Amino acid sequence: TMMSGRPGRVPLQFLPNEARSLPPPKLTDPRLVYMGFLGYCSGLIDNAIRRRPVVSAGLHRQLLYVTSFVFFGYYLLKRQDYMYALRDHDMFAYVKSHPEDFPEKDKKTYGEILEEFHPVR
Amino acid sequence: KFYIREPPHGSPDWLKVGLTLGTSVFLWIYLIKQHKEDVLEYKRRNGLE
Amino acid sequence: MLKIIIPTTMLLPMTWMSKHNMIWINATVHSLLISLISLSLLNQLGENSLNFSLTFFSDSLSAPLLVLTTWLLPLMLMASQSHLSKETTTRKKLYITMLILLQLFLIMTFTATELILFYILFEATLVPTLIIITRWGNQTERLNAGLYFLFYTLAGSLPLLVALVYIQNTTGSLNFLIIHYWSHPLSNSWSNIFMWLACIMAFMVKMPLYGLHLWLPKAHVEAPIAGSMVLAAVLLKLGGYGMMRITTILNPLTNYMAYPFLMLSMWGMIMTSSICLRQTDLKSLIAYSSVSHMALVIVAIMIQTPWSFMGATALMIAHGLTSSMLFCLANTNYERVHSRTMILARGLQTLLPLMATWWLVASLTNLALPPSINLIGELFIITASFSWSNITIILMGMNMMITALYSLYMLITTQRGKYTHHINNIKPSFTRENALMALHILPLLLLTLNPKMILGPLY
Amino acid sequence: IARTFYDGPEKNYEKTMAILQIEAEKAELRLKELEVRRLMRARGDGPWYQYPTIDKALIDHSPKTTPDN
Amino acid sequence: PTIRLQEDPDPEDENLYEKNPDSHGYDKDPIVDLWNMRVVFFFGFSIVLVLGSTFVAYLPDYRMQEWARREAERLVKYREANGLPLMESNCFDPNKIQLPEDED
Amino acid sequence: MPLVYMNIIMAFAIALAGLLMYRSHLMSSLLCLEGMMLSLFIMSTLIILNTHFTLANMMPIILLVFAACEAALGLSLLVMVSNTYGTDYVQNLNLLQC
Amino acid sequence: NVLQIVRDHWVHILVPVGFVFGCYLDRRSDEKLTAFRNKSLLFKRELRPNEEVTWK
Amino acid sequence: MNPIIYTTLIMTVMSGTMLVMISSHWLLIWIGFEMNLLAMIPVLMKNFNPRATEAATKYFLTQATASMMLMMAIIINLLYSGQWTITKMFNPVAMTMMTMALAMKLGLSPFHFWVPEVTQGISLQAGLLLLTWQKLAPLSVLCQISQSINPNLMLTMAMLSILIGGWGGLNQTQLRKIMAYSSIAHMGWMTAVLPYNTTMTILNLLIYITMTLAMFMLLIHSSATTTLSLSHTWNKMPVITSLMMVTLLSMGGLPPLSGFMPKWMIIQEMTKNESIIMPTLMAMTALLNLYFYMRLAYSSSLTMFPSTNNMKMKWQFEHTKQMKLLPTMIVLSTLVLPMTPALSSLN
Amino acid sequence: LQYGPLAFVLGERTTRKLTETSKVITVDGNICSGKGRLAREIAEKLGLRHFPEAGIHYADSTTGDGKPLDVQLSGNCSLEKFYDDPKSNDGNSYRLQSWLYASRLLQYADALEHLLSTGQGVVLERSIYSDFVFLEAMYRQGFIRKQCVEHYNEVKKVTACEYLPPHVVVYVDVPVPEIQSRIQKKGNPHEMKITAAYLQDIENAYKKTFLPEMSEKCEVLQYSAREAEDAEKVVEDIEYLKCDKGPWPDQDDRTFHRLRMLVQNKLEVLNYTTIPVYLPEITIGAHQSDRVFQKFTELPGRKYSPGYNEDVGDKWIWLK
Numbered sequence A: 001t002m003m004s005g006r007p008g009r010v011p012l013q014f015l016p017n018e019a020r021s022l023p024p025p026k027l028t029d030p031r032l033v034y035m036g037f038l039g040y041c042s043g044l045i046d047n048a049i050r051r052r053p054v055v056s057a058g059l060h061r062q063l064l065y066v067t068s069f070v071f072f073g074y075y076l077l078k079r080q081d082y083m084y085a086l087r088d089h090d091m092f093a094y095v096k097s098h099p100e101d102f103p104e105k106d107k108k109t110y111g112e113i114l115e116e117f118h119p120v121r
Numbered sequence B: 001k002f003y004i005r006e007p008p009h010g011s012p013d014w015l016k017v018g019l020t021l022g023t024s025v026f027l028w029i030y031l032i033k034q035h036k037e038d039v040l041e042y043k044r045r046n047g048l049e
Numbered sequence C: 001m002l003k004i005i006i007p008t009t010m011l012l013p014m015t016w017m018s019k020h021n022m023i024w025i026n027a028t029v030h031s032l033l034i035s036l037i038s039l040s041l042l043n044q045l046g047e048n049s050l051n052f053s054l055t056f057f058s059d060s061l062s063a064p065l066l067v068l069t070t071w072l073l074p075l076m077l078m079a080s081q082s083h084l085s086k087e088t089t090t091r092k093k094l095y096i097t098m099l100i101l102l103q104l105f106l107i108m109t110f111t112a113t114e115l116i117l118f119y120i121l122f123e124a125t126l127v128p129t130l131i132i133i134t135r136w137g138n139q140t141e142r143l144n145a146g147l148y149f150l151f152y153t154l155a156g157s158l159p160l161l162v163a164l165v166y167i168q169n170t171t172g173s174l175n176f177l178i179i180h181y182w183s184h185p186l187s188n189s190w191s192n193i194f195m196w197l198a199c200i201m202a203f204m205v206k207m208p209l210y211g212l213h214l215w216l217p218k219a220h221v222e223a224p225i226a227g228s229m230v231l232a233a234v235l236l237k238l239g240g241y242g243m244m245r246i247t248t249i250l251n252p253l254t255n256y257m258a259y260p261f262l263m264l265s266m267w268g269m270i271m272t273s274s275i276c277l278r279q280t281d282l283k284s285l286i287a288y289s290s291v292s293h294m295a296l297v298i299v300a301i302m303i304q305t306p307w308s309f310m311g312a313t314a315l316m317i318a319h320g321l322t323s324s325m326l327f328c329l330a331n332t333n334y335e336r337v338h339s340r341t342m343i344l345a346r347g348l349q350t351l352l353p354l355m356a357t358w359w360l361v362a363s364l365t366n367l368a369l370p371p372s373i374n375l376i377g378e379l380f381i382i383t384a385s386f387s388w389s390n391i392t393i394i395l396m397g398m399n400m401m402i403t404a405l406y407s408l409y410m411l412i413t414t415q416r417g418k419y420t421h422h423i424n425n426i427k428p429s430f431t432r433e434n435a436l437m438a439l440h441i442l443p444l445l446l447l448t449l450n451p452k453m454i455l456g457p458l459y
Numbered sequence D: 001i002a003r004t005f006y007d008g009p010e011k012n013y014e015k016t017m018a019i020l021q022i023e024a025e026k027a028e029l030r031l032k033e034l035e036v037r038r039l040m041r042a043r044g045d046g047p048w049y050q051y052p053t054i055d056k057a058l059i060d061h062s063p064k065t066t067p068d069n
Numbered sequence E: 001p002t003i004r005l006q007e008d009p010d011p012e013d014e015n016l017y018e019k020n021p022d023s024h025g026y027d028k029d030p031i032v033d034l035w036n037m038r039v040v041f042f043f044g045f046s047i048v049l050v051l052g053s054t055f056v057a058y059l060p061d062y063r064m065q066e067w068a069r070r071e072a073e074r075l076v077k078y079r080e081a082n083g084l085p086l087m088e089s090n091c092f093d094p095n096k097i098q099l100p101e102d103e104d
Numbered sequence F: 001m002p003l004v005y006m007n008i009i010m011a012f013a014i015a016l017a018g019l020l021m022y023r024s025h026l027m028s029s030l031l032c033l034e035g036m037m038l039s040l041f042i043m044s045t046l047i048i049l050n051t052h053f054t055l056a057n058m059m060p061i062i063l064l065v066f067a068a069c070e071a072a073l074g075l076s077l078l079v080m081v082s083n084t085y086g087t088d089y090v091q092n093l094n095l096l097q098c
Numbered sequence G: 001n002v003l004q005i006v007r008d009h010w011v012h013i014l015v016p017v018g019f020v021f022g023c024y025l026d027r028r029s030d031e032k033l034t035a036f037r038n039k040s041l042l043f044k045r046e047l048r049p050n051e052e053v054t055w056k
Numbered sequence H: 001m002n003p004i005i006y007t008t009l010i011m012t013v014m015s016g017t018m019l020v021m022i023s024s025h026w027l028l029i030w031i032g033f034e035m036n037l038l039a040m041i042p043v044l045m046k047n048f049n050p051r052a053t054e055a056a057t058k059y060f061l062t063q064a065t066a067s068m069m070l071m072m073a074i075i076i077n078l079l080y081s082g083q084w085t086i087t088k089m090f091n092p093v094a095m096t097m098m099t100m101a102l103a104m105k106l107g108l109s110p111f112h113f114w115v116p117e118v119t120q121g122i123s124l125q126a127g128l129l130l131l132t133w134q135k136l137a138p139l140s141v142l143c144q145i146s147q148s149i150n151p152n153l154m155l156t157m158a159m160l161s162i163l164i165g166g167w168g169g170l171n172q173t174q175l176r177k178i179m180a181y182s183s184i185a186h187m188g189w190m191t192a193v194l195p196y197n198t199t200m201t202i203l204n205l206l207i208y209i210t211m212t213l214a215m216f217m218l219l220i221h222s223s224a225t226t227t228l229s230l231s232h233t234w235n236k237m238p239v240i241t242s243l244m245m246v247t248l249l250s251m252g253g254l255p256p257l258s259g260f261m262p263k264w265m266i267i268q269e270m271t272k273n274e275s276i277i278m279p280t281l282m283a284m285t286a287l288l289n290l291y292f293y294m295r296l297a298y299s300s301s302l303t304m305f306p307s308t309n310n311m312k313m314k315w316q317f318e319h320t321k322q323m324k325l326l327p328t329m330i331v332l333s334t335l336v337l338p339m340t341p342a343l344s345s346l347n
Numbered sequence I: 001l002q003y004g005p006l007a008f009v010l011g012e013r014t015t016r017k018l019t020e021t022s023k024v025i026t027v028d029g030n031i032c033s034g035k036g037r038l039a040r041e042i043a044e045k046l047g048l049r050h051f052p053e054a055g056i057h058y059a060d061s062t063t064g065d066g067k068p069l070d071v072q073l074s075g076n077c078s079l080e081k082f083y084d085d086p087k088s089n090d091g092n093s094y095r096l097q098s099w100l101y102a103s104r105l106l107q108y109a110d111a112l113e114h115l116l117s118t119g120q121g122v123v124l125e126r127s128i129y130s131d132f133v134f135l136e137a138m139y140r141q142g143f144i145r146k147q148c149v150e151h152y153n154e155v156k157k158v159t160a161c162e163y164l165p166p167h168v169v170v171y172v173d174v175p176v177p178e179i180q181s182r183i184q185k186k187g188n189p190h191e192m193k194i195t196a197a198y199l200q201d202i203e204n205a206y207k208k209t210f211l212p213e214m215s216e217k218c219e220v221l222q223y224s225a226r227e228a229e230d231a232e233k234v235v236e237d238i239e240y241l242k243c244d245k246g247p248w249p250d251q252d253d254r255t256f257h258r259l260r261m262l263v264q265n266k267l268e269v270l271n272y273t274t275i276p277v278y279l280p281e282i283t284i285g286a287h288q289s290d291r292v293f294q295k296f297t298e299l300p301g302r303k304y305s306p307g308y309n310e311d312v313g314d315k316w317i318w319l320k
């Protein structure tokens, strides 16, 4: 709908070139830590389902779970940030190019505006 | 003990363990290198450093 | 405020990695430490809130509620660790996990700074409570109690979500500060009438309002003792917190939309208070008393005066403590005789004197004996109502007399008279039970020593 | 107690000012985004809601065995 | 079988005072029981209750109640010294307020 | 719209109504499906012939191909139904009622 | 003696460590809201010759 | 049936769906639907019995009628505008025919009758495939032509689907019919937001597919097709029943679980338009789905039902084949709400 | 590679390992017949694998360590109590019958799995196809009710239809007075209480139902008590049979693949034994179920999977 057709968009890129002009998410980003936590929970559930010692059955596969979730989450966060940046860019440009639709109104102080008073009693 | 041979060997499957650890280290190293590359590229584009 | 949130999320793995015979000790010790830490939120400012971060904040209304929650968790652990003795270690850890998750959700709920996050956690509190009731309840009515509780909540809470997203789209924000500073009057329109109803009805159901209260006796009677404690002490006050947070945008429609609810709260106050006079079940009696007290709090919030708000905060805290203590006291007898009928075990003052004095002190606090905080809250609400209309004093005084009547009736029935002859399994009161009663009742008096800490932001 | 556990009132005061500024900016941005979306969907002149039209590179501009195409 | 299930009989209640005449009602094991009592009493009555109440009783005046009293004393002294009405019914200066020019 | 177009669309509507009403036999419903295919083929051919869409001329042919596939599929299923009941009556296909 | 009791009671440090981590995280969070530090109309004051920030 | 032939049939079904997804020509989308149905018919009949034959016949008849209506709509659109490209669909009569054909293919009310019976008549693997993968192609086509969706017709069918799914699920004891009715209700929720935002449709579809995959793999792990046969699982796999209960609560739409995220977003989207009454009705109707999910949870996890003596033998044997992605699907089906903003990577 | 679709797509076919001597054989007879010794002799002469008759604790021998478990944890029934009080009101008779049927089904699955994996033939001392003679004996003597018979028939109908009947059915015919004399000479006090009507009912069920039913799909070689001792004669009689009437000659590679997938995965084999039919003899309450299951989990090598139990000497757990 809103963003599917946008000029100069490569179909299946998942990460346009202009996206590199944005700050990469830090490796300690709390969303990345939550993705790692999701990977850890998946590993523990895997241990419990196969009837293995939940905390300490397979450390290598739990590490693979956590690293896979973190790996996917990094690029997911990059793409999400890029799409939000695109939304903001397009909105600002549209505001700038259509001034008559977004006029700056007169600034009034509360000493001039008359608000009706509703007593509580 | 166990009358059957317990298909999952009493010693770890060293091939599977090695490959799993290897892909974990490879993914971590790739992620670190990629993060460095985007940090450098972003700094270069925006005139920061 | 993460200095309180993180230690509970650390209560989780500590419980799950403690050995089989030390889960209760570790949980109790560290929950008490967390309550001591949370006690630092009582140093409130006089003009604005304590805006810790973009997502969490605290004022003088949410700080006493947070302290009550953190204090209630150890009491729940101590009261639970008796009837779960034969349970396996895994399911005991699961029960403790349910309690910890409930406390964490409540802690985030009382301090969420925007309305959608508050809604998300206010609804998230439903899952641990439902699991507790329907998994560790005793009778076969626990399933129906859970169904009534869940659906009564959700039926009133979904329109609140619709109204909240509507408000955010129309005004642009749902942060409490921006909502308060940019507040505008609501016009007298049918659309505004239904927006008011959608914003109010969820918290009405959570109180519960008289007429929508039929879930509360079932849920509080069928639940285990920890479930009953958390339901009566804290989960009933979510409605009051939400009401006193969301009424800032409902003016001036409230002035004429509160007319039905006020009536339902006033006359209902009498009706439920009369039901306690003819209750043959102790837990149902306590639940109906909770309903009447919450009706008084609803009146306080609806008339919307500073004295009414102070009284509502004081009454919420006082009722939480008193109802928790009453439920624990009833549970002691239940574990003695395995029956909830009030007239089964009689004359217990002869056999359990110290428990008898605990019963007396709890009943005296329940009927609002001065200078307890129960009386302070009730009296402030009564004065606010008298300012609202001088005819309210008739209903309030009727309620006071009936409250004294059923409180002392329950005390006399359970404690006085002569013992039942055939009941010979009444063992002496344990140190755990007496300590639980003392830890319920000492904060009440220590709080009436310094009441300004529970009087709310209008103080 | 005040020195060991707490700070001054200025810290909370100015943190509140910063928080209020951030939330007010967010509210104004949300309202502006809603208005921009309404305008773009109504008109179709912006980068958004650009529904596809047939590519003109597909047309064959060659003699067609008949002069009038 | 004239029954419906192969179900265990309902067991009878285990009195904690039987094996442990001084039992505190915390656990079956006497050592863990005594230590549960000890930790509950020490961290509830000793640490949280008394020390927390003492901490609450000495909280600094962040509510500004003595400050307001001193300000009111100074204002009252000032306004009585110059024969002022001691409080104005206008919370804000009317000069800084622009009423609508006419309501007719 | 010429009158022949109207007749072809009416034929399609009649075939669709005939399929949506079941009497007893599954073969009759398969026949109604084949009739819908035939009407669609004639409609497409007339439209493509009137507007001289040269590359679209293979389109009806492909249509016919998948028509057969559907027919084949239905016939296969019908055999199985018969093998379970001895008749192709749709009233026997009521096991999934409960 | 240390090894067994440590492996038994290492769970008693999770909550104190959690509280310390929460304090550190609160400090990090409120170090991001300094856009008005020493800029308020009520608390605008001249910096001392030795200090650099009114509050941390 | 041969493993190579089964692989080829599954690959043909997937290739038909992909062909529908990657095509810009109406004839190619139709061919993709045809290939999908042709390869799908035998997969429903992998385990041969009269019930499977019944389900395959009913599915074939429904999908063939839908294909006829699809092709007729395409041809009418071609007649009124010589365009083969999938676009705005210049004709309204053809648009109504297309909407009805796609609704019949998806199972939206009142074309829902075939879904519970086809789901009950086939195995759990075929039911998983039918209730997850078969919903992609019609929804993709509907997403591409949302500009010409008649809001009245689509919203009526969506509200009808939600109501019918909620009511029909209340009467069901078999698990496959319960899954079918939940599928109908979720399809209604998915298509209700279609005229306003297709990103919300895709988000709801992904969350629904994750929850449905988790539910079906749990029901395959514990070989249960009825309520009472699932009542026995606690005595052999308590962990499986606990995970199943949490998944059921997530599908019920309770926060802070993943199943809350789609409907929440959907409600917000319709509130960006005026659309106030409809989201309220949809929430109060999803209450019914939550009710029968909770009934299943009471039977399976929150109470202990009586067992049998032979179960002891099952205590001595483990699971021979373990389904991969089950832990990941459970986690994604429950603990994903905090990552809600990532939906921006869907448009 | 554990057998599955992948092992079938490339390579492994089971018709290339069937060497005409597979000949799944079951020996049958009444109580205290020489069928066990005959089965052992046949197995060692023909080079097959002998399967001792499945008792109460058969499944315990193939899981964990082969040692049997407590009766409270496996079985929950005893044959001695059946011989003492066959009409007891606790439902021991039919509980024993159904547990024995499940054990026989498991043993048949194990024998079929061995045959289809190695091609070596097997000899069985009874089968799921003849377990019903005891059920009919109990029903005619009033030991069990008609509802128990219906439950047995339902489970048998949904279970035994998925397997192939044995190639050769061997019956040892020893008349009732002779087996009574053998029981008297045995020395087990509990077997001494078997009434003659019970053995008569067993024999009637065998001769009137089992043998005619297995005639149309198997090779039936009846014998007598005297002919059983000379097992070489029996072996040379088996070696000159024509296995042409059953469903075995009509088995392709795909049907064999389906059967081999079914015979492994013992949970799938035992699936329909625990159907939710609430017979008071075999239904167990929630409290007893929970207690006994918790007791079972506490067993030394039964808490985790067969490779992850530290307390039975499994090491390197954290790396598995």
Ligand SMILES: CCCCCCCCCCCCCCCCCC(=O)OC[C@H](COP(=O)([O-])OCC(O)COP(=O)([O-])OC[C@@H](COC(=O)CCCCCCCCCCCCCCCCC)OC(=O)CCCCCCCCCCCCCCCCC)OC(=O)CCCCCCCCCCCCCCCCC
Binding pocket: A041, A044, A045, A048, A052, A053, A054, A055, C009, C013, C016, C017, C090, C091, C094, C097, C101, C127, C128, C131, C135, G014, G017, H238, H239, H242, H243, H246, H256, H301, H330, H334, H335
């Ligand atoms: C928001 C804040 C954070 C919260 C996030 C959400 C919660 C946490 C994440 C959840 C997922 C995590 C793990 C999931 C799989 C675990 C399943 C399990 O059984 O666990 C067994 C296992 C113990 O079993 P075991 O040792 O293997 O041997 C015993 C046998 O297994 C004995 O086995 P068994 O067969 O006898 O067990 C039978 C039992 C087994 O049944 C279960 O165990 C229930 C399984 C839980 C369902 C999880 C589904 C997905 C998660 C959704 C959570 C929703 C949260 C939202 C709120 C709604 C709540 C529903 O079933 C029953 O008896 C029937 C009871 C019916 C009750 C119904 C309620 C069930 C649903 C409850 C869900 C709530 C979340 C629970 C989280 C913790 C649970 C372990 O538990 C653990 O040991 C894991 C605990 C966590 C490990 C952390 C340790 C790490 C190191 C500690 C230090 C930390 C950092 C150090 C650095 C600091 C510096 C020093």
Ligand SMILES: CCCCCCCCCCCCCCCCC[C@@H](O)O[C@H](CO[C@H](O)CCCCCCCCCCCCCCC)COP(=O)(O)OCC[N+](C)(C)C
Binding pocket: A004, A011, A012, A013, A014, A076, H203, H206, H207, H210, H258, H332, H333, H336, H339, H340, H341, H342, H343, H345, H346, H347
């Ligand atoms: C419960 C969570 C469910 C999630 C489902 C599985 C999660 C893993 C997803 C697998 C990632 C790989 C998919 C694609 C990677 C490379 C291909 C790339 O080119 O795809 C492009 C972009 O990739 C995908 O489009 C986005 C996939 C991202 C999925 C994650 C969002 C999940 C929703 C938010 C819930 C939070 C979950 C947190 C993580 C578990 C497509 O561009 P475009 O041709 O233009 O799209 C056409 C269709 N549109 C425009 C209508 C959308």
Ligand SMILES: CCCCCCCCCCCCCCCCC[C@@H](O)O[C@H](CO[C@H](O)CCCCCCCCCCCCCCC)COP(=O)(O)OCC[N+](C)(C)C
Binding pocket: C188, C189, C190, C193, C210, C211, C212, C257, C260, C261, C264
């Ligand atoms: C079990 C307990 C549950 C809780 C109960 C909550 C009760 C909710 C009721 C809320 C009261 C106010 C609702 C309507 C506001 C006005 C009252 C009504 O009399 O309207 C009059 C108008 O006359 C008629 O009454 C109009 C309404 C007629 C239809 C309403 C009757 C509904 C019957 C009650 C149903 C019971 C409630 C429970 C439903 C499940 C007022 O005249 P007017 O000054 O011009 O209009 C003022 C409002 N305007 C300005 C916006 C237009």
Ligand SMILES: CCCCCCCCCCCCCCCCC[C@@H](O)O[C@H](CO[C@H](O)CCCCCCCCCCCCCCC)COP(=O)(O)OCC[N+](C)(C)C
Binding pocket: C033, C036, C037, C039, C040, D002, D003, D004, D005, D006, D007, E047, E051, E052, E054, E055, G023, G026, G027
């Ligand atoms: C001279 C005194 C006479 C009377 C004494 C009165 C008794 C008062 C003591 C009671 C204390 C109540 C607990 C409240 C703690 C407040 C926690 C928090 O609010 O303060 C933290 C301050 O950190 C403190 O160090 C907290 C330490 C308190 C820990 C309490 C643990 C006590 C438990 C003892 C149990 C016994 C253990 C042995 C087991 C047998 C904040 O950290 P931070 O944001 O960075 O600093 C901001 C303020 N600064 C910048 C000005 C410094």
Ligand SMILES: CCCCCCCCCCCCCCCCC[C@@H](O)O[C@H](CO[C@H](O)CCCCCCCCCCCCCCC)COP(=O)(O)OCC[N+](C)(C)C
Binding pocket: C039, C064, C065, C067, C068, C071, C317, C443, C446, C447, C449, C450, E048, E049, E052, E053, E054, E056, E057, E058
């Ligand atoms: C068994 C034997 C019984 C009989 C024997 C009794 C023994 C003697 C007792 C009799 C003496 C009565 C006490 C008389 C009052 C003196 C104490 C008073 O001075 O302290 C009050 C203060 O009391 C405390 O404020 C009470 C603390 C409140 C409770 C703390 C909470 C504890 C945590 C438990 C959780 C509770 C959760 C519920 C929500 C909060 C006064 O408040 P304030 O004038 O200002 O402080 C004075 C100090 N100043 C001047 C520097 C300001």
Ligand SMILES: CCCCCCCC/C=C\CCCCCCCC(=O)O[C@H](COC(=O)CCCCCCC/C=C/CCCCCCCC)COP(=O)(O)OCCN
Binding pocket: C152, C153, C155, C156, C159, C162, C163, C166, C190, C191, C192, C194, C195, C196, C197, C198, C201, C205, C212, H274, H275, H276, H277, H280
């Ligand atoms: C335990 C049971 C509790 C039951 C509580 C449920 C009922 C709560 C009250 C009704 C909530 C519905 C409100 C809908 C959401 C509010 C949003 C809003 O107010 O926006 C209005 C929209 O207002 C509405 O559309 C409201 C329509 C209501 C339809 C739903 C009917 C539900 C039942 C109605 C009667 C019952 C209500 C009270 C019952 C109390 C419980 C006994 C303005 O929108 P616009 O269209 O843009 O108009 C301005 C520009 N012209």
Ligand SMILES: Nc1ncnc2c1ncn2[C@@H]1O[C@H](COP(=O)(O)OP(=O)(O)O)[C@@H](O)[C@H]1O
Binding pocket: I030, I031, I032, I033, I034, I035, I036, I053, I079, I096, I097, I100, I131, I134, I135, I191
């Ligand atoms: N389905 C059954 N029901 C009751 N009892 C059975 C059943 N199957 C075997 N038994 C008992 O198992 C006992 C030993 O079996 P059997 O083969 O006859 O003795 P032996 O091994 O010495 O030849 C017998 O007493 C028989 O009654």
